[PDB]
Symmetry: C3
Subunit: 77 residues, 3 copies
Amino acid sequence: AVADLQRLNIELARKLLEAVARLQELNIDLVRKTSELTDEKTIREEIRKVKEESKRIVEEAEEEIRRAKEESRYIAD
Amino acid sequence: AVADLQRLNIELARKLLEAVARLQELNIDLVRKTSELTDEKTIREEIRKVKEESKRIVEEAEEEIRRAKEESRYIAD
Amino acid sequence: LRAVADLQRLNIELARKLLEAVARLQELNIDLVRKTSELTDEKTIREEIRKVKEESKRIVEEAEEEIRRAKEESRYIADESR
């Protein structure tokens, strides 16, 4: 069952990479918006929003890994 | 063969971390320069540059997973 | 109980640590941006930058070290077989 488990890891690498890519675009955006704003109350909402968004993304990736792990177990029998 | 496929997976994980590491120094550089500058046109150019550089890095990592996908196929048969 | 199933969990453990690294770095980056908006003294800001940089390097090196473990542990599993 070597090819199946291998395909699984390739899938995983893609998930984590996409998460990494989405977090990067989030950080470029947080820096861009912060440079644009002067009001600190307003800047704090952008930061608070990026933070929870980042948290959603990390959690999504965490569940994907958990699912890849469970699927490995079944393929293991 | 299993050992070769695992070697492939270790290689891939390392390259994904390398992309993560390069993005982080990029993000750190972007914040540093933005704190240094006041002119927004110049700041937007720093932001634009870091962004395209981030995509290049992201695109290379995507190609690497793709290579790893091809290579795994060849080895399993 | 396969050698392959054990190699597989090694990779699962490996993806987690790297994600954990990415998560930690992401929080370092947001904190640095937060403090940057809060401060006007450049000396202070540059110190916060140096701190995040050193912290980010350690996290990356911690992850590089775990990869070296996975690689070595994987080798060990090679002769070990069903």
